[PDB]
């Protein structure tokens, strides 16, 4: 798919993504904090439609992600991110998508997620996260 | 004066400041790099005028600041920053302003300046720098 | 089990662990680098015996860990780390132990693992890793 790299910021204010419960994650967009002010990240869109939109509005800065988990697996021949779950110090958002396949999880004892990069074609192919103190 | 805090970014592209050879530094504004794109920081201006403008355009990203130095001293009974000098791996910019008072200098062996904060009334009362790898 | 926290160091030179083909990981000990000198971490040993020892000697500093993966699962009623695999920029060490249960993996695009903490009773109950640039 088409690769993207938002870079690193000061924190996360909002995450907007779309998914299809029978396939995988589609669109992905993040509203970051940039030194106290919101910074609207570019909308990384799937090449197809039919996804269910989801808005995760965090109570920045008192609320922050402490763990990201999900599942990867095939959708037709492509290995993609089928499901994602975001757990903050206040709530758990998700799971969104197919909760089957190979699980992965990134619990953070100390630090913060400050950015995202990845690739999206029909679905989210893969993604990485920027971490900082 | 009026305090300001630009925060931290990923690099520095250009620095715009003004000075008066009889007093101190007046205005201060920086164009930062934000994940590969220019980000125009707010212009922090003095409450008065009569300063000489200076523009330091760095050949980002090959050129970067390795040392910042200057002088602090009394002007009209206030302790302010009277002069600034920026030394990069390619050239030395300055000194700008009056080289009188108490000198200070910050050589960087490993790391980068990625942000500025301080306060400006008639002149730059004080400033601090964000450092990162 | 007995908790341990090695803290953070400059890098990793050698890892010594033990495992049992039918249960899980037992002993865990690391020889860190501390500003260019080897620093032998405390040997965190299982309460029981019967494990097969493994020595992972890295060609520090040119060789470093790029991904840690493994499995967690139930052993005699306890959820423990059953298997571990260490992938460096030069080769893959493992898997060691039992590759059954729930997988987990931590690939690193940028940064280094510089420390370990966790708990060991009969087996390795859990563990976390210190990351740094």
């Amino acid at each position: 798919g088409k690769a993207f790299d938002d870079g690193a910021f000061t924190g996360i204010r909002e995450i907007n993504l779309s998914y299809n419960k029978e396939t995988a994650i589609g669109d992905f967009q993040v509203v970051y904090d940039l030194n106290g002010s919101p910074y609207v990240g570019q909308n990384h869109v799937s090449f197809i439609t039919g996804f269910t939109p989801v808005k995760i509005s965090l109570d920045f800065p008192s609320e922050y992600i402490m763990e990201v988990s999900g599942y990867t697996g095939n959708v037709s021949g492509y290995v993609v991110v089928r499901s994602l779950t975001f757990k903050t110090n206040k709530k758990t958002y998700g799971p969104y998508g197919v909760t089957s396949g190979t699980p992965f999880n990134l619990p953070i004892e100390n630090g913060l997620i400050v950015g995202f990069k990845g690739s999206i074609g029909y679905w989210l192919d893969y993604f990485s996260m920027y971490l900082s103190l | 004066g009026k305090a300001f805090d630009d925060g931290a970014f990923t690099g520095i592209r250009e620095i715009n400041l003004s000075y008066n050879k009889e007093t101190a530094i007046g205005d201060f504004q920086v164009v930062y790099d934000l994940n590969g794109s220019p980000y125009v920081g707010q212009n922090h201006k003095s409450f008065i005028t009569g300063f000489t403008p200076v523009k330091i355009s760095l050949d980002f990203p090959s050129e970067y600041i390795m040392e910042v130095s200057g002088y602090t001293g009394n002007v009209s009974g206030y302790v302010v920053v009277r002069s600034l000098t920026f030394k990069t791996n390619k050239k030395t910019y300055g000194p700008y302003g009056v080289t009188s008072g108490t000198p200070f200098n910050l050589p960087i062996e490993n790391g980068l300046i990625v942000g500025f904060k301080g306060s400006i009334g008639y002149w730059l009362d004080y400033f601090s720098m964000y450092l990162s790898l | 089990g007995k908790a341990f926290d090695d803290g953070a160091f400059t890098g990793i030179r050698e890892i010594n662990l033990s495992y049992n083909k039918e249960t899980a990981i037992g002993d865990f000990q690391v020889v860190y680098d501390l500003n260019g000198s080897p620093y032998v971490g405390q040997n965190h040993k299982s309460f029981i015996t019967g494990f097969t020892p493994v020595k992972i000697s890295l060609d520090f500093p040119s060789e470093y860990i790029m991904e840690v993966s493994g499995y967690t699962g139930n052993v005699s009623g306890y959820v423990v780390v059953r298997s571990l695999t260490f992938k460096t920029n030069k080769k893959t060490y493992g898997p060691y132990g039992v590759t059954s249960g729930t997988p987990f993996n931590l690939p690193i695009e940028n940064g280094l693992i510089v420390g370990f903490k966790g708990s060991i009773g009969y087996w390795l109950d859990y563990f976390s890793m210190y990351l740094s640039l």
Binding site: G115, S128 | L58, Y64, L112, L133 | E109, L133
Partner: peptide, 16 residues
């Protein structure tokens, strides 16, 4: 080095 700041990056998860 360069004039660009660095950050720890973990991943990726998904396709190789």
């Amino acid at each position: 080095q360069s004039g660009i700041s660095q950050t720890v990056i973990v991943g990726p998860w998904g396709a190789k």
